[PDB]
Assembly symmetry: D2
Homo-oligomer: 261 residues x 4
């Protein structure tokens, strides 16, 4: 089919990319970075996130693969020594696909912008204090004062979410998880403290109390948003598709990354 | 239908129980605590847990209701002033039902015993140090040394799980959550630290390293188990059914219990 | 003596300030905001922090007092109804003094700047990733990757330090406490995780790994520092002095703020 | 002087003990396990704790030394290869001493018993729920409901205290630290959550609310206490003395145990 290969850009990843292109040339495979059906990412999870966001308008028509030239990643979970076997099996194309849930962020002004996250979307304040009202399915839940908030996909839970004390959830669960960053708690301000796990179709809305300027991040991309009226989180109806060429279970991947390999 | 009412046993709950029995007598309703189809619990969440476990062999044929005579409970979530309206609507019996997931614990010896938890099942050691091997779907995940482990249902997450830093998950999610109690972590022992959220059909197995005697709890019931070979956790195929007579959303119930009411 | 009164600036605090000035006029007391010996702060703990920093060059010659016109503060811990009794006892001037430790921050470039904190000093990155080497008394302790770090005085421990999971320490202890903000931990990056409590004369040094631009905060003041070579923390030899006019124990103040009042 | 050597009891530690006794025989040193002035512990930190408690009535007249035959301990912090150099320098006896603070626990009935802890003293319930009133210097601070409480010395902070989220404090600080085990927090029960660090002469008292039977631990020793009226914690006036034969800083010891060695 049509395929493309993105590279981290160091010698190791560029040379592996050139060798995989050469290997693909021995098959009925066309290099096309406009309408690829296979997107191979060579580098780390950061390289993989840029690949996902490069092609997030054609998610339904792409199977993603990650190769880690450094340490094992959660998306770049195949070693460079398997690249030749990868080329072979991608060429035949009878592999299977597994799908992970994604997070949809909607930002409203006083106008609207939507974003897909593969790891998480976070909200912080633009210098001053961060106060927002947290609304769950039109129900006012809490007034949060602190550093900010983080909404994670399931596969995002091993990333920023983990550093904030959130739970790791198996990515077959269609959910999103909200974690707090340094919440103020006394007898004036009061937050739940615990991470919150939301199913599909639940809508978490963040509403400004005073200042309406926020620094909003989506995966690696962080930009200052002004005149914000509302930030809405929900599990996306879209999903990322991976080419499956072996059994590498999520919990083993968690074990290899955090316990021992 | 056939119904029964369990009471916490103080004056307040016994008198409310007698008044509801009197109210039920005005309808085609029979009191039967052997094969009830409606089990009303009057007291707190602890009273409700005993009601669930009193009838856990007829879960498929029972709708549960809880009335809190003290503070709002997560299962006893209706006020005594609504008891008359409750009798009325339970008598007609066109109410709807909502189902929550349950946790199945299997304990193997060198023989087998199974238990259903509505909140959680926990494992601790019988005096000495607690060391177990944690196996996830036949994959050795970690060697845990510490005080113990807790496996929570979704509706259990607001209970012991919350005090251990676990996430609160909406009970429409068919999952279980594993949290650590005081894990030892250095460059000898190593655990994941984070709460772990498991979907249906995943099996978490705890296996003894040295001592094989453990104190195992299931909801309020804690008993010493000897000659234990394995403890297995999975989401039960069984579910608890509640009679639904109003909209009291889980997240509002979380808000009213932990934030403000 | 010479005194001055700073005000939060709302009606309530300005009017209390004018009334205390009037009351002071009945005694041998001179208003002087250049060389005061008594600095009264009317507002909240934030107003008190500005008062401290307004006069941090004459700390050895000033006794501070805080009045809270809103909720109880940890530095503004006297109610407005006691202002008349405060004027009386400050005028006679046989009150006693209690001293709290302070935190000295040194920032070195490639030049040097020093700062005193009453609550804490925090270090974060200027947009990009935050990586620093943590050196304790010339001993390399850890390579920290995460959101940032916070070094708190004892009286600062109830503030930002508390939201980061740090311990509350009685301010009679001459120490400083280092807490992490969202540290990355796997088998590549490794931090201690726990808050660290340091005695007098211990020096904690933060050293850049790659990027040398940091956002450094000292109490309420946060400024971007460029070309930073080192950030050094140690317990200051200077101390803040409070006028003591009653017994309001620190632990009771903790109780009233976080448990119940 | 008079010395004695305790051993973990495995081959490795017994043989090292016999060799050190032989080496000591070449000097004016007498083996005496009744009134030793030097107590050498060979094994791990657990062996060292038994040595301390074996001789806790002669703490003022003993310098302790620990040798780790397994992994580095915080009290057993010298390697077996240094045992010959240890014998030499202990024999001459111009070494220096460093002292660590200790924790005094008082248990009152309806009679009194006192205990010294080198690591920590913990309180849990005897099966049923654990509810105690926490009193700080005769001031009621909180009503704690949960699994239990832990009061740690400074050198104890790297042990159980660390697993409960407490801070690590340098043992030159004369203090004790109170950490919670799985506290219940809602709008009925309310605890501070944060670890609490107390200076010398502060007294923390635990008082029963209903049940008066508790499982109290002091270092490795845990015994059921009945008819308990009060548990009192304070920094001991006694101190443990170590023979100092090299520079092995506490923070480096923390680094080697938890970060890398
Ligand atoms: C470096 S690739 C970008 C990812 O880094 C992760 N990340 C950012 N900051 C942190 C942090 N403080 N701790 C852990 N992961 C982080 C987020 O999940 C982001 O999507
Ligand atoms: C009192 S009813 C029994 C329930 O109490 C909860 N529980 C027990 N111990 C604790 C604790 N330490 N913190 C919070 N909840 C607890 C558990 O979820 C149990 O099912
Ligand atoms: C508003 S007065 C300034 C103080 O607010 C405190 N502070 C800032 N951010 C937070 C936070 N996220 N949580 C708690 N306290 C905070 C810091 O201790 C600072 O000195
Ligand atoms: C094994 S030597 C005894 C010491 O083990 C430590 N300990 C006991 N339980 C735990 C735990 N769950 N986590 C960490 N350390 C522990 C306590 O500090 C005790 O003094
Ligand atoms: N989904 C993820 N799970 C775990 N780790 C992740 C993920 N995505 C990116 N990273 C890491 C975070 C540290 C910096 C390098 O990239
Ligand atoms: N599912 C539950 N969610 C929250 N709280 C619960 C639950 N079950 C029982 N409790 C409480 C725990 C404290 C003692 C009284 O009962
Ligand atoms: N030392 C302090 N201890 C507790 N709280 C403090 C302190 N200083 C300032 N604050 C609060 C923090 C929340 C915003 C208002 O000011
Ligand atoms: N003071 C201590 N600091 C760290 N670790 C300690 C201490 N005392 C004993 N241990 C360990 C705990 C795990 C089991 C082996 O002994």
């Amino acid at each position: 089919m049509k395929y493309m290969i993105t590279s981290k850009g160091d010698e190791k990843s560029d040379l592996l990319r050139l060798n995989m292109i050469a290997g693909f040339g021995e098959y009925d495979m066309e290099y096309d970075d406009v309408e690829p059906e296979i997107v191979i990412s060579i580098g780390g999870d950061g390289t993989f996130l840029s690949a996902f966001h490069q092609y997030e308008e054609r998610l339904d028509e792409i199977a993603f693969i990650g190769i880690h030239t450094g340490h094992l990643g959660f998306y770049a979970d195949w070693r460079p020594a398997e690249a030749d076997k990868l080329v072979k099996l991608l060429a035949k194309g009878e592999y299977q696909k597994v799908s992970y849930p994604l997070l949809k962020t909607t930002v409203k002004y006083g106008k609207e912008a939507t974003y897909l996250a593969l790891n998480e979307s976070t909200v912080k304040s633009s210098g001053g204090p961060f106060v927002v009202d947290v609304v769950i399915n039109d129900i006012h839940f809490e007034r949060f004062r602190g550093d900010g908030l983080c909404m994670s996909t399931p596969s995002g839970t091993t990333a920023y979410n983990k550093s904030l004390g959130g739970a790791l959830m198996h990515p077959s669960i269609e959910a999103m998880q909200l974690t707090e960053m340094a919440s103020i708690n006394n007898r004036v301000y009061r937050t739940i403290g615990s991470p919150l796990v939301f199913p599909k179709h639940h809508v978490v809305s963040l509403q400004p109390v005073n200042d309406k300027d926020f620094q909003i991040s989506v995966d690696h991309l962080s930009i200052l948003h002004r005149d914000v009226q509302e930030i809405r989180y929900e599990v996306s109806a879209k999903k990322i598709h991976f080419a499956r060429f072996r059994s590498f279970p999520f919990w083993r991947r968690v074990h290899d990354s955090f316990i021992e390999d």
